[PDB]
């Protein structure tokens, strides 16, 4: 599923991400835009052989199991394929664990390089939330 911008904002807000660990909703929408272009089915292979999955490009080296990332952890205790669902619940719950682990949203390279320090509220402007 490819989300619209306000559709995704509303879904993330209903799943408790607005101001989760101090990150306003616009940060999450911005990250999803540049990580996956709002496409829940996005995958991308990394140099180390791990793969990023879903709307927030969660990495199989640490967070989910794809059966082909040797020596990897599965800290969200989910198959990576669950992160590609049109239901974002699994991706959101896993993201909540990532953002709480110490480094905040700096875990998302695209957020660090394209959202951090910008006017992220623009990403929810005009949305009925």
Residues marked as catalytic? 35, 52
Q: Among all residues, whose Cβ is closest to Na ion?
A: 88
Q: Which of 74, 41, 36 is nearest to 56 (CA)?
A: 36
Is 66 flagged in the annotation as binding?
A: no
Burial letters for 98-110: b for 16+ Cβ neighbours within 10 Å, e otherwise? bbeeeebbebbeb
- In the complex, the smallest distance separating the C-beta of residue 89 from Na ion, rounded to whole angstroms, is 6
Binding mask 22-41 for Cl ion (x = CB under 5 A): --xxx---------------
Q: Does 126 bind Cl ion (CB under 5 A)?
A: no
Are 64 and 58 in contact, with CB atoms under 8 Å apart?
yes
In whole angstroms, give the CA distance from residue 105 to residue 26.
Answer: 12
Q: Among all residues, whose Cβ is closest to Cl ion?
A: 26
Binding site for Na ion (CB under 5 A): 11, 87-88
């Amino acid at each position: 599923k490819v989300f619209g911008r306000c559709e995704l904002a509303a879904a993330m807000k209903r799943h408790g991400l607005d101001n989760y660990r101090g990150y306003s909703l616009g940060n999450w929408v911005c990250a999803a835009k540049f990580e996956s272009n709002f496409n829940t089915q996005a995958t991308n292979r990394n140099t180390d052989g791990s793969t990023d999955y879903g709307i927030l490009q969660i990495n199989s080296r640490w967070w989910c199991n794809d059966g082909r990332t040797p020596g990897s952890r599965n800290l969200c205790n989910i198959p990576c394929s669950a992160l590609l669902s049109s239901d974002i619940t699994a991706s959101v719950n896993c993201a909540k664990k990532i953002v709480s682990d110490g480094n905040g949203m700096n875990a998302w390279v695209a957020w660090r390089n394209r959202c951090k320090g910008t006017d992220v509220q623009a990403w929810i402007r005009g949305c009925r939330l």
